[PDB]
Write a protein that binds this ligand. Structure first.
Ligand SMILES: OC[C@H]1O[C@H](O[C@H]2[C@H](O)[C@@H](O)[C@@H](O)O[C@@H]2CO)[C@H](O)[C@@H](O)[C@@H]1O
Ligand SMILES: OC[C@H]1O[C@H](O[C@H]2[C@H](O)[C@@H](O)[C@@H](O)O[C@@H]2CO)[C@H](O)[C@@H](O)[C@@H]1O
Lengths: 437, 437
DNA sequence: TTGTCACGTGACAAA
DNA sequence: TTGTCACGTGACAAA
């Protein structure tokens, strides 16, 4: 698709309150006549960098802040320049999450952190440690149910356990993240992953479990516990499960450390509606009424707007979310975050499945998470080099065929031309290419 | 995932009533103690052939009958052996849809055909032809609405228009489909796709429109018409739209001809639960109570079970579905169907976006749809030949380097060795490889 | 059908 | 960093 003047198109993930956001777009359309379309395409965080490099893509893209640094580095986002009065309306730390190279690259919307979600009727007192989950599963499997089910296909869900005993993504020292210092293969990381793999090995969890499978099992009452964000609450509400939201379990006595995301809205640098997009985000979405409309669809978490977070913070589920977020860390927004996520995703799936040992999967993840992506010019240099190597050889064999007058078959390959040249120069070449004088 | 003895895992597309099917599973578990898990993974029709070739995948897979011929050719499905008494409970033509090389390869469930769905409040009198839609759109645009929106990313939804004036997939002759006689590039197909592309050029439809975009627009009352199947009805029921289901519009005075699919259930040849699978399908799903539970979730269309179809056929929406189905054709189940669908999908998306002209897109689609997929042995033949060609050349240059005494630099490529050979044999080689005596 | 050479990126290594 | 050769499939042709 392509941006065009007078209309706004928004991309937001399918697990957020896109219908609520569409209502805000409707009030925006009535007040100034600009149509707003909200769409929730799949793999939007991957599609955007592909289409925006050529000027395509939506007017506004919603995602957690961790992806936006890469978009900025690639020149895909318009610089955000809110007035002092508006900046004052959001918590300063949410602005930090969307600052890259000293510039604001998106509007922060809400703070997301994973929590432990449990079925009060099935589990009145949830466990406080990861280590007691296996025994709890034995007891619950006797009654037909299971202890815990969560998304094992996305490392965002498994990261809190991996990070608990010492795993880290990029080390932060002296005011910066060190891109070549990766903590995915240390003792803490290995221990956390090993415990997860052992749960699968001991049949307390299934390796192929994904978001829908886990959500269904918990919402239908088949599993005592799940790990998810604030967005998931709405479906649990409509179900018949009585749920609580609490702190994630400890592992080896240390807290689970979730990677904290700030749902953010960036403006396509290619959009001709940048002023309209600011007006929508600043004066319609980032307001009490606008955030409420979205939050009523699927909870946003701890919103960045001070005025409305004071209402939401009363919710004990948001309080547990922020308890988990205090034990966690705000994600970096550096461009290498995407390579880190792919690396850890492959490590978790490969170890959970048995295709690799935990040691082998995390060793590869460390290499992949620090690997430097070659530049376009480096790729073109390689391409051109091979083009040149083949052209030189082809000219040589063209000359040999035309002027050699070798005793060659009607149709033969260049290897047979090489052989005829070898014999003419005093060599004997055997059938397999063994060559000598 | 691998299937375990004593439990059933089912795969079914996410637009079908998987929750209703899960209720049927809970009854199977209640009466036999065998757990049944229903999952709806993305791209399941593509994942199944990849994982099932090695014994992985579900016990049962649901999809339209057109993919099952390919699965059966690759040995992925267990042969279906219903007693004659059971076969008599289903309409004969639905058994034909799942017969491949004389054998039954799946249980037929329901007959699906696309229909025109319209908003009666915005559009009391639906249009009878495609040709009048552009004018209808102009009128509705003055009211802040649009005429028609439907999924342009899947060729299933555009095929009824392409086939209307004479487009066909594979010609049927002498009791068989001719896999080399493809009709995606004839005058009828061109006329149909040109009309669709012209709708986009005159701003009556958007090229990026997909399933979710079209469903939301119709179910929120923003567009007067959509094209979809019976599965979509239940979401329209809960919405505020008062809708009708009617015959698809004519094009050039000829009826739109949808490709008719038979939702079918195949049994993984790797399952050790083939008898449990057969018991579940025959005695629990393909029953009045069984299909009712799935139909209440998301309508199946015209079910293959005569006893329950007598009830469902009373519904005017099913009558419209079968009116469209009579004007269409049952899809072939031959293995080439997947290559046909991929080709037409590319043709539609490339023409709708302007990346290719209608004639260029459909010319390419005809070639790709008729192309013979090289066998594994043909690919292996090619791989080994080039491996051998490189190995012979490597041995020649190994011997030249070791016994040549060519006065070469410390590091050089094989082209430089070849040049030394040439000069030794009485040739002169320029820098670009120009070689003469 | 088999067969030649092109193609751009991967595995590896010297520096 | 630059640089070699491998790698399997594509474009094209003889038959
Ligand atoms: O799993 C890797 C993934 O983690 C985060 O994605 C979260 C996202 O922040 C949440 O809003 C929610 O949608 O769940 C996602 C995980 O499925 C990162 O933001 C993302 O970049 C990363 O790929
Ligand atoms: O678009 C190509 C696609 O068409 C059919 O898929 C249908 C399916 O039969 C319906 O049940 C429903 O889910 O819509 C699908 C299209 O999105 C063919 O059955 C399928 O093989 C083909 O790829």
């Amino acid at each position: 698709m392509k941006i065009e003047e007078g209309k706004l198109v928004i991309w937001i993930n399918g697990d957020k309150g896109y219908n609520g956001l569409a209502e805000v777009g409707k009030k925006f359309e009535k007040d100034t006549g600009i149509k707003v379309t909200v769409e929730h395409p799949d793999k939007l965080e991957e599609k955007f960098p592909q289409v925006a490099a050529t000027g395509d893509g939506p007017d506004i893209i919603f995602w957690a802040h961790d992806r936006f640094g890469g978009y900025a580095q690639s020149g895909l986002l318009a610089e955000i320049t809110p007035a002092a009065a508006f900046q004052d309306k959001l918590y300063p730390f949410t602005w930090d999450a969307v600052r890259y190279n000293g510039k604001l690259i998106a509007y922060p919307i809400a703070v997301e952190a994973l929590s432990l979600i449990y079925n009060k009727d099935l589990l009145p007192n949830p466990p406080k440690t990861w280590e007691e989950i296996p025994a709890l599963d034995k007891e619950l499997k006797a009654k037909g149910k299971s202890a815990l089910m969560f998304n094992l296909q996305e490392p965002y869900f498994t990261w809190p356990l991996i990070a608990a005993d010492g795993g880290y993504a990029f080390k932060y020292a002296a005011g910066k993240y060190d891109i070549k210092d990766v903590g995915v293969d240390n003792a803490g990381a290995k221990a956390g992953l090993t415990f997860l793999v052992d749960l699968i090995k001991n049949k307390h969890m299934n390796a192929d479990t994904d978001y829908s499978i886990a959500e269904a099992a918990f919402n239908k009452g088949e599993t005592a516990m799940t790990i998810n964000g604030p967005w998931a609450w709405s479906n649990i509400d409509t179900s018949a499960v009585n749920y609580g939201v609490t702190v994630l379990p400890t592992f080896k006595g240390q807290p689970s450390k979730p990677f904290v995301g700030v749902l953010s809205a960036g403006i396509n640098a290619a959009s001709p509606n940048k002023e309209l997009a600011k007006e929508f985000l600043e004066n319609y979405l980032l307001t009490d009424e606008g955030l409420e409309a979205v939050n009523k669809d699927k909870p946003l978490g701890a919103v960045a707007l001070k005025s409305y977070e004071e209402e939401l913070a009363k919710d004990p589920r948001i309080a547990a979310t922020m308890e988990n977020a205090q034990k966690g860390e705000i994600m970096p927004n550096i461009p290498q975050m995407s390579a880190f996520w792919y690396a850890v995703r492959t490590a978790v799936i490969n170890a959970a499945s048995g295709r690799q040992t935990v040691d082998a999967a995390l060793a590869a993840a460390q290499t992949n998470a620090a690997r430097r992506k070659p530049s376009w010019r480096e790729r073109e240099n390689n391409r051109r080099r091979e083009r040149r190597r083949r052209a030189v050889a082809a000219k040589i064999y063209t000359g040999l065929r035309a002027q050699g007058d070798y005793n060659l078959p009607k149709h033969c390959d260049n290897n047979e031309v090489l052989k005829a040249l070898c014999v003419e120069a005093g060599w004997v070449v055997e059938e397999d290419g063994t060559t000598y004088r």
